[PDB]
Amino acid sequence: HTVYRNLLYVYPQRLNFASKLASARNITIKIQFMCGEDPSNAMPVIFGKSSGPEFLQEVYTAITYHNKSPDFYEEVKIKLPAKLTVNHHLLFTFYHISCQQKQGASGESLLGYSWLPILLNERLQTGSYCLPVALEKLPPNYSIHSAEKVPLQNPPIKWAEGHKGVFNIEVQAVSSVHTQ
């Protein structure tokens, strides 16, 4: 069946932590398209791998190329809601393997978060972004701000690498015909 849709395409390109103790292959990233700040606000809008198509609330990825073909790129494809508002945002959750866990464990745990409002300052947020990572948790009302400039919070936000941008993505909206 032939359909026409306006889709958001998100390319998680590079993750560049300064830590010589970790590598990007060991950081997992969860990607969600949110309509609000509550955990229940993940929209079922991400194209899955299956035919159908299936729509997911989240995808997990690791930004590394050592185990990929040279032609590889990660492409997250999102069915935009017909009406996009300031409440819609990409939400990224980072997971890592903490060193020297109890009993020698080697499971993954929450590292932090980043996000990108899709509409900010009356402009669609397409193009290239280098995003910082907020550690531990997100403050209320995070999603109306760019992660690069959040008002002072109480308790205060802590950022990876003193608020340096570490996560490179590209974002574009494309409306086209799909032959589902």
Author numbering: 557 to 736
Authors' own words:
DOCK8 is a Cdc42-specific guanine-nucleotide exchange factor that is essential for development and functions of various subsets of leukocytes in innate and acquired immune responses. We show that the DOCK homology region (DHR)-1 domain of DOCK8 binds specifically to phosphatidylinositol 4,5-bisphosphate (PI(4,5)P2) and is required for its recruitment to the plasma membrane. Structural and biochemical analyses reveal that DOCK8 DHR-1 domain consists of a C2 domain-like core with loops creating the upper surface pocket, where three basic residues are located for stereospecific recognition of phosphoinositides. The DOCK family proteins share two evolutionarily conserved domains: DOCK homology region (DHR)-1 and DHR-2.
